[PDB]
Amino acid sequence: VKPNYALKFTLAGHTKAVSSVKFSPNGEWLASSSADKLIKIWGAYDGKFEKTISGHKLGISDVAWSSDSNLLVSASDDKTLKIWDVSSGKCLKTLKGHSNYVFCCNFNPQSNLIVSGSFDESVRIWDVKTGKCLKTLPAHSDPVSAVHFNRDGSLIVSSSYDGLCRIWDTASGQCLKTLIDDDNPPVSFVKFSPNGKYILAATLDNTLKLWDYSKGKCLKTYTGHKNEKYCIFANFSVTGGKWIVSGSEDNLVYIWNLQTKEIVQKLQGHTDVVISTACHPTENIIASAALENDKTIKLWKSDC
């Protein structure tokens, strides 16, 4: 009924704050992005440094894998995204269009498209093959903190400091739904559940919420952690027991029971804000990463 994650590896190498960590869909690799303008690749199971990828002119806020684990896309303060061939290290395309920092990015499941959110308050949809912007959505009235495709790529969910989560039809670009609670503090992260019928959202009032997309109501809420200043990622953990995982501004990784909403674990070891966590696709493994005063990445493993 409770997991028992324990520290297995610490991964040091970035020279500035880490911004994001992501496991490759094939489970072999961890990718990390940093304010040091670099992407680093690490072994998912042993934490062994693999390679560095560079090219952005300013630091990076997000990085994401293609479904086949062969490409990455990165989002940078230099106002661009870059698509990378991981094996060669080549920058395949630079995606230009945003007029301010690019903050978040994701491939669709088919990985022919990329979605991005920016401080310019727009969501953009890009063709992966050509690198051209297919659509610009006037999505929000403040910076866009997260963007995510659902399981079949038909929908996009975006979140923003304007307090809104919005759901977009990928094909038409139409706003299908705006989620509004009783109070609407800045929304700092959002993603669909694996089946696409729920939405997990972080807000800058120390609160994560699980919404029913179709009925448009909040069902579960998770608290006890600290989150008022940074856009901290959140995960569903579903390889063992059903958990919610998030970093926190008190330097800990928080794990909740998805159903009962109780904190089941708090992982100690980081020395600065934990900005990013990821859950391994098949194994009960968590990656965590911390900001400027720490700069390390940690791999934790559990029996359930």
């Binding site: 940093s34 303060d77 940074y230």
Partner: peptide, 12 residues
Amino acid sequence: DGTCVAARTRPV
């Protein structure tokens, strides 16, 4: 240096 900056790693 001054180029090593990323929005996510700065507070609101």
